[PDB]
Write a protein that binds this DNA or RNA. Structure first.
Lengths: 151, 352, 354, 351, 150
DNA sequence: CTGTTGGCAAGCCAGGATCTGAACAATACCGTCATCGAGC
DNA sequence: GCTCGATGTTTTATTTATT
RNA sequence: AUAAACCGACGGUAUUGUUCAGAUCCUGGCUUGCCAACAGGAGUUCCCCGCGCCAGCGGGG
């Protein structure tokens, strides 16, 4: 019972310019529940199932930073290692992500993605966005601090 | 059915109801996970010393190893019924120890005594030496009929429920009692990582800091008490009581097991919680439900709801699998639905 | 009935009323979820040291482990009534420690002392001295009547309520007390994720940055205080007092448990909140309603309303389930006699629940 | 097949069901790790002395053995070593159309025949012979009214049997019960409070105790059971086997049970037929690690083990598995049972 | 392969006031995962390798007791932790019992409290090995050292 | 039927001290060799 | 067929470490 | 059918009573989100029906 992350990535990359343009326009993830093209995208990924649908909200909202923002690589590079590898993010901003409340965290993450334009392993990040909670924030900070401090 | 099975699910707020040699909470590994434990002996003594027990069943036995102090007590209590000599010789015959006027006379081990039983015994001793009947033959004669002595155990029911052994004296032959009931240690249905209380004792003559700094282990818990009464044995141990009397005693055991909680650290933690769930069941052979909690209950809007649910599910699995159909009543509060504990108690009183 | 149960639901604005050795809030896992905690001992000290106690009950006990300082204090306070020799001898008998002129004499552990009690003992030791009575024999004959000593506990009620332990001295026979009042650690009915105040200290002679940087854990909460008084024990501990006196003391305990709040960090967090809900339940066996919050109360226009809700509901369930028909009287700020004012609840408790 | 293999997984709450001369839990090293143990003798006694056993095996129908009906086959069997005079005299004094005969009966009766022959040779009889052989006769009589108990469990500790043929092994073999997992036992530091002692308690002690998911194994020699029942049928043997299954699934030693009360039933019972009896204990040679309890991983490990080795070990043959859990099942070669009773009936009908 | 415990000791010793202050206010070992300064401290000592992770959590907690609470003192085996705790003469035996009987995370809290009280002088790499393993054997050894010394 | 791109994301400096960590009482008993002849 | 009781014989080795 | 066979290590038991973690403390100074833009194109609509100039109009769906 897991969302095929790579399939969703491909679905987004192949999606018509119009629909994805409609999706990027959203300001916060909940607003995605008012866009038709959204459902049209996340329908073959079990949007009917609630847990899957919160997960999907986050995943799509991160995928809507741009279409060439998140260059999916493949072993795997975590989000922390990626944002650290960009060299464009300072630690205080990562803190400003992991301390942010509901919805706001996703916005800050979107801005961080636009800013860093990270090369990462997407399915890993998808798993992270699914269990978005104290453990993933923690390991995010861990990866970021380590990768930064090695340089 | 011969067996009365009592199951209790009881939730306790933060507390420390049972600790070991190092004042830390008693625990037990179950299903690979640590459970907080309340030992069975603690439960039994908590029950037998309770006000309810005193009002409804009678006097708890007198458990001691100090035979001199006991001698004095019996003299004070059985003095206007027997002469001191007879009392002394009776104690000396039951214990196997010489009862003189020593400051300290010690028995073989801690042993439960019933004052009434002793009275009956010294009646027998009186009528024995009066008829010029020595001690050995007296032992034979008394060995020929033990039921009477067990009616003297009607005067000390906790011995009829929990048992008694002796290694020395005539008790060795006459006081050998196998407990009627039977009871398990209370273990939590979930894993527990016990909290620690960092406390200070503030001195009123010491301005700077505190006079004591210390730690105290404690925790919350949803405990599973189990206890089945053997019944035919309860009738035997009471001298041949009826099934009604045994059923009523069992009812009292249900009430106590449902409501009594050890007084340990309760003047500073006060976990005076009654059982949220109680279930009684008649059966041909004993059945414990502890394996409902072998897989530790994971929290879900508390530990109590998933515990009761898990209990019910396992109960159904077992009943369906082994084809058990003994009468059963559950009281719940969160097989029977018992709006009140009293209805469940009367239901037990009436053979189910 | 014998048992007076006291339930309190009280909300605190963001604060830190009880912390450990790491300046972290004291907590306790209940129902699988963290609850901010206020230990019983903190409540008790906050009560016996409170102005209300002093004005309504009397002087609290003198709790100390330093027998030298205590020696001096007793020498001063009882010097107008006893020879220093028998004051010293008395303290030495009670403590099981030798009292000379040493600057540092230590007891076994922090012990509750009542000056009037020790004075009483001084009268006794004086009489024994005048009758050439062996110290052992004095212990014997004094052991034959604990009641009087407990009247001397009338002069120190916090001991009568919370008890006293002894490991050395004559106290081990004469001074052991079982607390009448039992009380629980106040825990939040809900889950709490405590916040952190990241503070600075600005040095007026330092331009670049602050002199100190730190963090302090704090949180708001809806606490469930529970405390039942045992009563017959309260009469015994006071030397055979009357039921009426015990009821007056119990009433005072209700007031305090409804109004007294630990002084910790109150100078900088000032969570001086009075209790919104107070139910005294008269009854026959101790009963705690903590399990009403076993399932963590979830927020719904506050934690207060849903908490009083859950409490009332579980109260009903238990009441009819176990057939508890003792008296039962409650007071609130929003078969169970309802009271508009706390004072009417108090007056109700004084009248044996009538 | 000739053998019935009975496998049981049964989980016990904190208890001490079998100890040694130091009151320590019995254990055994398996796969290099300590397992709590319930000895074979304790388990088998727990069965043999149980009420269920007494009702269904003790008071069985094939219980009583009539020396009368056994006259002819005895007459030939012993007829080669003794003549019919001594044989009939023996039979008649013992008692005061059968096809076959239980070997221990033949043996003991043959001994009695030796005795009465040597009694005639020396010139003696009457109450002399009936006082020399009083206790012996009493013995053989009590044993002659316990045929099923002797066939299943073997002769009792004090039997009266006198011949090499009267060394009756039980038909059932019970292995020691061992836990499927490593166990570091718990300690209970208890006090005994004196009601006459002010300071402290009157006794202090410790008691070792532990939980545990146990694996009981037992097998039944059908042929030997029939032969020890005077040439009974396979079906009757299967009824006895049914009872053995029930007892191995429900019976628990009474040691320390008054105070720890581990009255737990089996969560899994499997029965399979084979020509060679095998224990599936090597399913737990690598000690089972706990994942949400020790029970589910134990059953799972059992199933996986069976799936792996059953074919090669020649365990092909009838196999049924009653279970309370919903763990992924065995190979489809094993017939699933929802109640214990359906399993026992599956056993009655020869699988 | 093995954690340079003295290097970690000196590292902790010459750490700036800030990072140190951040590591110190932790209330249980796992919370050290929230502090970046922690990662920057233990990264050169093999943190990105799991076994080392657990070991280092214990070590850095015990050090987080303070800069001046654990006095390293070279071998003349070397002063074991039990011996040190006894040598302080401040620690009651019962507390050592409660320590060695405790469970995970609680044991480290109680140990840090003990260290804070005793301010022990000991062979630090030795204690580091002990913390690396910390089985039941090590805890029993702790208790028995403590007893034999008094 | 059709939805875009570039360019850019900061630095300084600062995290404390005082003082305190308990005592007493209690840790069981039985049986798991044998002989002989006597009294019962 | 036993239970009773006196009775054949014989014991002591230590005492501060570190996976 | 193996130093095998037959074959319980058994019974009794509160770890108890006493205890604020506490006093002091700005997170602070600087900063356009900005430049381009018709919502227009495109009559497929699958039936029953009534009246025609055959182009196309209606009522029921």
């Amino acid at each position: 019972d897991e969302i095929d992350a790579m399939a969703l990535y491909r679905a987004w990359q192949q999606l018509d310019n119009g629909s994805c343009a409609q999706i990027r326009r959203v300001s916060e993830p909940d607003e995605l529940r008012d866009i038709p093209a959204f459902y049209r995208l996340v329908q073959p990924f079990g949007w009917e199932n609630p847990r899957h649908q919160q997960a999907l909200l986050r995943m799509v909202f991160c995928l809507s930073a741009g279409k060439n923002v998140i260059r999916h690589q493949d072993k795997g590079i975590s989000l922390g290692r990626a944002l650290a590898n960009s060299g464009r993010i300072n630690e205080r901003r990562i803190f400003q992500l992991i301390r942010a409340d509901r919805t706001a965290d996703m916005v800050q993450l979107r801005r961080l993605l636009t800013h860093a334009e990270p090369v990462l392993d997407w399915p890993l990040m998808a798993r992270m966005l699914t269990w978005w909670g104290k453990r993933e924030r923690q390991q995010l900070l861990e990866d970021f601090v380590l990768t930064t401090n090695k340089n | 059915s011969n067996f009365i099975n009592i199951h209790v699910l009881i939730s306790h707020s933060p507390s420390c109801l049972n600790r070991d040699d190092m004042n830390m909470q008693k625990d037990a590994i179950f299903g690979g996970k640590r459970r907080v434990r309340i030992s069975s002996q603690s439960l039994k003594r908590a029950m037998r010393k309770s006000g309810y027990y005193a009002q409804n069943i009678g006097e708890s036995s007198l458990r001691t190893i100090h035979l001199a102090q006991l001698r004095d007590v019996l003299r004070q209590k059985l003095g206007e019924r027997f002469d001191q000599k007879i009392i002394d010789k009776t104690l000396a015959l039951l214990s196997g120890k010489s009862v003189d006027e020593a400051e300290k006379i010690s028995a073989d081990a801690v042993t439960p005594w019933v004052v009434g039983e002793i009275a009956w015994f010294c009646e027998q001793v009186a009528k024995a030496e009066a008829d010029n009947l020595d001690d050995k033959k007296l032992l034979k004669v008394l060995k020929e009929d033990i039921a009477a002595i067990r009616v003297n155990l009607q005067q000390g029911v906790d011995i009829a429920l929990s048992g008694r052994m002796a290694t020395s004296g005539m008790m060795t032959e006459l006081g050998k009692v196998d407990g009627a009931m039977s009871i398990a240690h209370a273990i939590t249905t979930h894993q527990v990582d016990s909290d620690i209380d960092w406390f200070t004792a503030v001195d009123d003559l010491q301005e700077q800091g505190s006079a004591h700094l210390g730690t105290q282990e404690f925790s919350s818990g949803v405990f599973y008490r189990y206890a089945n009464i053997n019944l035919a044995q309860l009738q035997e141990n009471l001298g041949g009581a009826s099934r009604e009397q045994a059923l009523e005693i069992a009812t009292h055991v249900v009430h106590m097991l449902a409501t009594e909680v050890p007084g340990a650290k309760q003047r500073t933690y006060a976990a005076f919680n009654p059982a949220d769930m109680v279930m009684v069941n008649f059966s041909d052979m004993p059945l414990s439900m502890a394996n409902a909690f072998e897989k530790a209950v994971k929290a879900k809007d508390g530990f109590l709801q998933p515990s009761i649910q898990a209990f019910n599910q396992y109960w159904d699995r077992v009943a369906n699998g082994y084809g058990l159909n003994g009468a059963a009543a559950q009281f719940s509060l969160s097989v029977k639905q018992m709006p009140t504990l009293e209805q469940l108690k009367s239901w037990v009183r009436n053979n189910g």
